[model samples]
Target: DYQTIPSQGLSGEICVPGDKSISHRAVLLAAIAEGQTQVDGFLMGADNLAMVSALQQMGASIQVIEDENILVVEGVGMTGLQAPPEALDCGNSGTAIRLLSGLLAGQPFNTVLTGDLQRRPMKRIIDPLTLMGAKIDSTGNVPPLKIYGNPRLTGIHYQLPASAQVKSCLLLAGLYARGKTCITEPAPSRDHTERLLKHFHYTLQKICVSGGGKLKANDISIPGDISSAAFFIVAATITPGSAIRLCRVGVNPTRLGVINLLKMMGADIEVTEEPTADITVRHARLKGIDIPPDQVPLDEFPVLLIAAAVAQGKTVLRDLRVKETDRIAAMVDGLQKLGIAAESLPDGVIIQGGTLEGGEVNSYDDHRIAMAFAVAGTLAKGPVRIRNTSFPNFVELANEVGMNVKGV
Candidate 1:
């Protein structure tokens, strides 16, 4: 187990990895954009590299300039993707597999998608893509997916059930179809796909619908990952005397629920735009409120759970059981061990704020969980011990920006 002592508040400046979601989209969309696409600040993580490898297998010319740290993608154009000679491995990224599912339908060959089944379950993307005439075979909605290509896809006005991945996947598929491909959402998820797609000159029109929003398309620079920024946002917020500045974070409206949720609980935050984004957050006592799960974006869930545990009142979060792990279970279990009044529900959790006393905790082998508890360690009455750990690089990246995370 790794140990972190209670801190006397945190202060510093942070630079985070490029947005992982946007990084995945940047490479794929750029490869199909018909020219040399230049991407700055791309997230060079294991999960996204898995995406790069898959694209390379399909005949796109992609290179990562290590010295300059930029990605140059030569587009094969919309219909130029060739079938991979082997099954594509998606590593630990659900977004890569799910979104690519739609983008691949226009290819004229068969492909099998295989990887860590934990990245994401394939059912959500599979059903919609199959509805558009893509033939996909999988077991019980999981991946190890074998997808058969369709020469042409039929676009529909599909409504998504709180999943941006499914919506974005279908929209990418719609790009190659003969008709207008539109998507309707029950609630807004992340809009990285739409924003990046438009940046690259795809014609997209977003309109407000009954319960939610819709719209549409980047060589674009990926800003800092706010999902990654969140652990520190909470770490600084709850640790007395702590204040931090996060630089270049993606503040896209659809993905800002964490900021809004913290605001609803009365966080002390200020934001500046232009010349990229700079966000400042300081320590504050947080108040709890109810959050409908549909309002919570997938990327924000883990850190939001941390914010809820430290708030002064009870916070209720729903529909969190489905993720890389049972995130609901992982957070609830970890929080209880830290002396918080937290428990798992069928679809969510209820957390009651209490004094935290450091104790042994498990991450369930999840990266976000590992990171959040590291922040939670600063709030403990004693040193916190965490198991199933990794992330040596984040230790420094976070410290460089002011997180000051230390362990062994």
Candidate 2:
């Protein structure tokens, strides 16, 4: 039962899903707010669902209105979430565990958070929460986090270790603390947490420090996520004769590194400055272009893999071993499975372009890898089969956009 998709060009306006990161926070923050919170454009993805299910177990009332993207969340205020009777499992969502760790830190109950697979290191949140008066423990720095909540917590100016998840967890925990909570990243990670916090009319201050300085907290308004837009961008680019526009994508200086890297590779992209909004959204016309090794970093490598597959010239990617999976290896192996020319290096991958032949590709339980390969399948010579060990909705969303995608 192999599903087949013929090579076809895509042309249409696709309103991408709500930012996964932001959607998680929106539901969690609303659940902890003093009154009912209404959210529009919530991402109904599995990762987000883990958070929803976890919150529901903690006594929050969340209802999905049928035929609409509206999610109604009844709040328990900041101090109202009762400790779950069992360990709160976050499934594969790293954000849920990390951020919720901080939020749970300041509560006066003992809670445990666990996950499947090679559990992500909890020290990222444990050490900082300890500094913020949180009694947190982990099983050898990994998941199965035992957090003893401290109702009387105080904020501190903590420097982060280049992880947005850790930084955001501490920030969310700080909202309930007795003083100001400040986080300084070694480099900018995603600012969706900061931006979304602002959108809810919370007070935050951003002060630029030395070297490419940190953003101080004041308040933030979260803009739409461009990471989601990457899917449509790749789909429209390789879809023969297809062209479309994505409006209001967040172009935070920190997150725009992907856009910049693609542009330097000669991608037909255009950015329009929207200063009055919380984030910058750009409309781009994508033409296949070669990507260099130096341009792709660990965080932005997966999406670039799809771009490389369809580009006219050779696209080389390096230094991708530090992600959720050996993404470089996964992409290379997956490309070969689809009958594309892909060479794997010790550090990265090289993709040679011609006509893409379609076949089934493994997802490696990585969401980005699953989605990226599915997009590539649409531009392949035949149907693309995506094995959904994790993000099962990748094909469902692709179908929503009129793409002939199927799951194995």
Candidate 3:
């Protein structure tokens, strides 16, 4: 798919899909909890759909009663999951595969997990799960992992790497294990898993969780995904005279790196958490700063790079390589293609603020990369063409916000 963008500023009010991380967790938590779970504001993305499908395969009855955003899940309680007749396919969602690995580890059935993007690193979760007595066999660091279900799981305390997925994986596994599962992180990442677990009435004392607790089902109204709203936020910030309001965006502290970084870069943005969590961002002359490593979320880097592209100075972004793709290399490559001065770091990218010239760029078939450049196109000197996007409702959302974006 080719997405053509005419240089234009955006202005309007919009709400993005529900928080992706929270959507995944809500579905998973609801699937394993007792009673019925009514999930509203659910992200209707392909990745989240894959998670819903995988859970359904494991015997959770999920129904789509209202378009794709609302779901009624009849959850099978802890230890109520039945073995799937075939391998579970997560379909390009790392969240589904990794988190499911932990969930399946304690079940009393053998299973295999496969996916498109499951080729990414599984060792992080694999090692930790192995420590908790999960008999999982992987192809080196990647998946199609064969998990032998063992009911004799013993939780262990782990000093973990800074990854919310890994942390979440262990927490899910900890639910079925026999002892307390404790984890300490080098830096705080997304705590949606922990938060949702508590919402389901599970016991968690900060980083420590006791095993074998039955989770009671609760209605979850997932907030709009900040990561998805990020593309629109940058478009409004970088395009001259642009102003946009994003409603009910997830303002979770761990996932607010995009908002925080943009605010530090001098973007005219205001956040209100009362009544609703809404963000209003307006066009401003952005000055790039060396993004604090501790304040960054890995998933928000693509749009953050777009924001950096139009800033007044160089923006230093670090620790970005280990994502769905090597985002550092991908963004640096795409930025340079658009006449921006960007250099790739071993783990990150340094983008010098400059004008974005109209040009064709590859999305590398990644949705975030595709949407980032779509935002970039609005501020370009000429019509920007993005190829291989496998795009989303971004064009519609952008068009609704008064930007000129359409399919070619």
Clashes of each: 7, 18, 0
TM-score for each model:
0.90, 0.80, 0.94
Error of 1 at 291 (Å): 2.6
lDDT of 3 by residue, 1-408 (tens): 655565566887898877888889998999989999999998887888889888888888999754758999988899889999888888888788888999999899999898876446777788888988899998654568899999889989999757787889999999988989999988777788889998999989969898878999999888988888888888898888898899988787877788888999998888871023899989998998888877765376678888899999899856533563376678888889999999987665688998998998888877788788888888888888777612547777778897677777
Off by over 4 Å in 1: 118-120, 139-142, 207-218, 273-276, 318-321, 401-404
lDDT-wise, the better of 2 and 3 is 3
Give lDDT: candidate 3, residue 382: 82
lDDT of 2: 0.66
Best by the TM-score measure: 3
Query: Which is the leading candidate under lDDT?
Result: 3
The stretch of ten residues in a row with the least summed lDDT in candidate 1 is: 208-217
How do the residues 1-408 of candidate 2 rate in per-residue lDDT, one tens digit apiece?
A: 225375355555555656667778888877776566777767776677788888887888888762465688877755668878888888878788877887788888888888863534566677878887988877674577888889888878887646677777877788767767788866666666676555555656881111111222222223356676676666666666665666556666656656676675556555551121222222233444444533342144676777776666676644422562477778888888876788876765677765667777787767787778767776787777766532445456567665566544
RMSD of each: 4.0, 5.3, 2.2
The models' CA-based lDDT, in order, is 0.75, 0.66, 0.83
Residue lDDT tens for model 1, 1-408: 567777787787777778888888888888777778788888878888888999999998999875554888888776678889899998767777887788787567888887776545567777777777788777654667777788777766777757677777877888755566678877667777777766776656782112111121135778888888777788888889988888888887776778888888888878781124888999899999988655676355777778888888999865532563377678888988988888777766788977888898898877788888887887888888888512776676665544556666
Q: What TM-score quantifies how close candidate 2 is to the native fold?
A: 0.80
CA error at residue 330 for candidate 3, angstroms: 2.0
